[PDB]
Design a protein around this ligand. Structure first.
Ligand code: EDP
Ligand code: D12
Ligand code: CL
Ligand code: CL
Ligand code: CL
Ligand code: CL
Ligand code: CL
Lengths: 311, 311, 311, 311, 311
């Protein structure tokens, strides 16, 4: 139980691969996702080499304790992987074929700027710290990287499970460290978003705009203010349950603009009344009449500006 | 501790059986359910065979470490099953009778399209990866598949516990994998749904429709808008608190239609007043009178269309 | 480590016992209660017999690994018991005296039909699967059953901790299984219930009835509708946090009836106004005057009907 | 190994103590608190006694496996303590000095009757079950009982960590049990309660009382009812998140009283209008004028009665 | 497995270092943060020293069980560290180079007085208890104290990861303790705070101030009270979810002042009406006109006072 010696002065290349079995619990708030997968490792340890003629066997099976296995760890895991060795197979030349089944809650940041049209790239970082005896470098076996066809994330389109084939080798505390990036690309499945979140919220803003075809200040205060309460209550109903993102989101910008529209509508309603009370019903009625077109138009344009601005 | 050798080139047939002891924690949000059950495994290892005359014993009991046991794993489990071996029995011919008790949170998707009248089929996938020495294939022992009569899920009718007898054998990473599906069929209990969710939500809506027997715009704005707030508060009140399904549900469609009805009712109330203010009380009163029948009728039909459309 | 042999063809009687140390985490939603307790087990393994003269000890203490212990398991536990062996003592005859401190989240259904006046019987099921060598049957040593006086459940009166002395012996997967029932009887502590839940909700409904001493439709719409919003907001404030029980509860029936009363009150208010607007202030005022008595009376009787109906 | 033998017929006295290192996660709802602390155990085992002259060492260090250690357990812990042995030191006379570092979630009831001015006594119960060979009794070593100066609980003043020096020795299942009570006294930091909870809630109440300087029934219904909604919404905003305490709290009594005041205020507003409509504006105006003083006075007195009643 | 002996009467110096790999789950409510990092320990054990000539090896690798490793523990961790030894290397002189990978939820208080402009210093306390044989003192190896560049906390600026080089040596339960302070500095990066929390909350407040350009008491009651409900509902929407901080926060002071402004605005509205009803429309209109400037000015100044007062 010591690393295999180098033929020359070459480092030990370990052939990695992750095959996704199950993907679940994608926590948008915590920026985590639980994955249940296979981990395939391969390296050549000539100390384990055998003659298939003399041995009379094609490949020999070993116990993890019996042979030297590289210390492969994950970088962005919450709690260390629940490892279960499935099989260890040494071919006659000494090439070890290691396979384990694991499950891990992965920490991977998410960008909600383009939400709910957002797409995400989920990372799984593999790492190996080079020993005293020799240096270890990770490699990707593209045949052993993939995902089950049943692999799902509710509300997401699982685009691809790939791996940046070139490791990021670097020095950490006077030792070499070889890091591999495994990427899971997903795009949001948002059709229910329009009837469930946008349209209802829109009718609410629209009900406020009916105050442009009314002269009763009592009815108009009730119109714009009550729809504001209705809007806040509606947003309480839908609400994401995630702490505010430090950055400004697309949906967040629209919501901000909606609060601004309720404020401006109150200004109009207030002005309309003050002009009417200050015996200027020419200006009072003209503003109201303008707003009837101004509010829907400006809203429509301001959303076009934002949509363009974010996408 | 190596697989039993084949008589000829035949694969190892492992006879399974899952007997449900307890079923609990069905998370509609997470699409999981925890299950407490028995796992019965059986295979013939002639290396372990004996003469009952010479041995003087009926059946010999072994420790898991002592004999070769196939690596049976579950496909759709969150964290690897809490396994406890109950008994291992080897009959004189070498037939191993393995039984373990386990508990695992099983990831199984749910279809809420027909909610709350929905029925679900819960999957438990058994799998075995074929070794170098020989190929392993799973089989179902229908005598050892069942469930306790005490097995319950609050709010569900546990219909059946059945098993797809024919395994799905396939190749994965150059090795054969035999997969079995165990189905748990459940149907929802929607007794309380009508008085707890549907009826109060309908009363709130009907309160809005009373604005068709009134000419006071102040009282009418108050009627349709306040019921809208009441409706949103009532929906906050029900609190399913499951993130919106990406897809459109039956209940979700009705709710959408309800938001639309509140909007249209505001249009009517607004129009009624504008016609009355624009000295056309013939059209004003006629629309209000029409709506008195139009709103209940269109609602009734639109729900019939949906009910039919979803069921 | 094999069962003790029978003198004649008698089964092994494992005398049991459960002594509650702590009881906590009663989750009404999950139908679970966490219990921290002692487990007392006794059987005769004559293979362990000794002469105290030759031994020099009147009783010998053993490690769990050293001797044969029955495989006792709990039926309705979420995750396998957190077992800690306190003591194993053998008397000269070979009578084993086992004691273990365990803690487990027990799954036991709850009947909320009579809530908040409901009483519950929480179950803890002990089981043992009979082996090939000999059959095992469980018994209750009534002296080693009981509960600490400090044992509490906030908001419940812990009535008793008793055992169904006669085990339920049955056949499961061709083997005998002996099951014991441990019952924990509890009754709820309502009383905060009247000032915290009923009266404030009851006041809100009476505030709606003040619309029977008013003729202003604007003030009456505001009265009955605003109290409806107040009622929903109040129920959001109290709310149980449990998903709807599939069955109709007593409290749930009252709440349903309250929603119905808000609807009927809106009908009255609407009718009163329509009669007054259709120049029939004789009928308008008579209905309002009737309601003044009708609403409180019908409510009082309808609650009496329900109280009687549920209890 | 086996307990030390008694010199005469005396029981083994175990001197126990621990200094709180960290205290965190005080869950008011669950009546639990996580504590991270030291556990110091001491007893004399003359079998381990040595001559410091012959040995040439002052104190010998042992491994837990090597010597006999008493089975000390905690009575009120959720899941069994996370024990880590720091040091075992045996003095020449045979006095063992055991010290472990542990962390455990402790179940200890809380009395919210005087909330938010409440003070609490948190219990940690130590226990030891006496063996067959000899009886074990617990003692407190006051030098080894303490709490870190850094030990904090957010929103609590950590007063004293003391221990009831005299154990509660009792018989349980025919064996002696010695129990020590360690108490953690804390007082609540209620400063932010006045500006955050009591004053905004009261401003809301007073806004309702402005209806005593108004004659408009429409404006008065709006005043008292809308402030009621505002009050419920405000209470939803502040809300503790803890299930209802079965008993009546001080804050709970005030809140009850507030709901009663909103009801009575609606009675006044209703009466005032009915008298005014019944052409009796002498009585109408007199009641309103009375209330202007009656409501603030009765409130002030009723709170004095309660404050006195609870404290 | 006993501490190395001192050359003279010197204590054993253990050179420490913590390298942050991942930082996640910063719970503002619980005052915790999970950290995934490296722990580098170094000391000289001359009992392990060797001749590189005779041995033919530069550095020898040992198993944790084989050699003596100091009992290093963390002070402020929730649950015992998830330790995994990466490498143990002994140089010819006997200098041990220990490296492990750990993950732990660290309890570290937070000061929200200056929230959301607040900055925090996160502590990680290393400790070692001095043994009987010799005294142990901790040291910082500044070369082995860093953080990964990828290390992130969403909504925070990870400024630095430093260590107080001089340990805090003290006596605890008659033994010497050496404690090291590793402090992580983070400044809250909450850009989105103004458009997401402040701006909408202010629009809501200003809507109330429009009641200064109106004489309709019905419309004015509706203005100030409804905006107050809107404000509470808005605050329910943006709710932090953390229990009230015992102390007064900056944001909390502003919110308090906002509740006070809604109260004063109701006083004005009430007074304005009473003066108008008591035939004094000179004073009524003058106060309303004053308020138009008084309310915005006093608000602006009062916020300047607070901003200055807190920062
Ligand atoms: C004319 C008073 C209407 C009133 C009940 C009003 C709207 C101003 C409403 O409709 N809803 C709510 S939640 N608050 C209010 O004050
Ligand atoms: C008219 C004001 C409506 C108030 C709605 C409040 C909803 C709060 C829900 C909070 C759930 C925890
Ligand atoms: Cl890991
Ligand atoms: Cl599994
Ligand atoms: Cl169990
Ligand atoms: Cl314990
Ligand atoms: Cl630690």
């Amino acid at each position: 139980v010591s690393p295999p010696p180098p033929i020359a002065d070459e480092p030990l290349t370990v052939n990695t691969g992750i095959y996704l079995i199950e993907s679940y619990s994608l926590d948008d708030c915590a920026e985590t996702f639980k994955v249940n997968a296979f981990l395939s490792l391969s390296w050549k340890d000539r100390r384990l080499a055998f003659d298939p003629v003399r041995s009379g066997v094609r490949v020999k099976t070993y116990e993890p304790e019996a042979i030297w296995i590289p210390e492969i760890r994950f970088v962005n895991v919450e709690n260390a992987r629940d490892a279960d060795v499935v099989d260890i197979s040494v071919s006659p030349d000494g090439t070890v074929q290691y396979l384990e089944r694991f499950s891990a809650r992965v920490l991977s940041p998410l960008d909600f700027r383009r939400y709910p049209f957002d797409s995400q790239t989920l990372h799984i970082y593999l790492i190996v710290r080079s020993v005293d005896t020799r240096n270890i470098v990770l490699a990707v076996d593209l045949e052993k990287v993939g995902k089950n066809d049943d692999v799902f994330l509710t509300g997401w389109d699982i685009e691809s499970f790939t791996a940046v084939v070139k490791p990021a080798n670097f020095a950490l505390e006077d030792r070499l460290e070889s890091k591999l990036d495994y990427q899971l690309r997903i795009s949001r499945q948002y059709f229910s978003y329009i009837p469930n979140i946008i349209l209802p919220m829109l009718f609410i803003l629209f009900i406020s705009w009916t105050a442009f075809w009314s002269t009763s200040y009592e009815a108009n205060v009730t119109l714009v203010v009550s729809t504001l309460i209705a809007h806040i209550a509606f947003n309480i109903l839908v609400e994401t349950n995630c702490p505010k993102t430090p950055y400004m989101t697309y949906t967040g910008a629209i919501i901000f603009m909606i609060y601004l529209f309720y404020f401006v509508a109150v200004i109009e309603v207030t002005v309309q009344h003050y002009l009417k009370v200050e015996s200027q019903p020419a200006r009072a009625a003209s503003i109201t009449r303008a707003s009837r077109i101004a509010f829907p138009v400006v809203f429509l344009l301001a959303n076009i500006i934002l949509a363009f601005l974010f996408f």
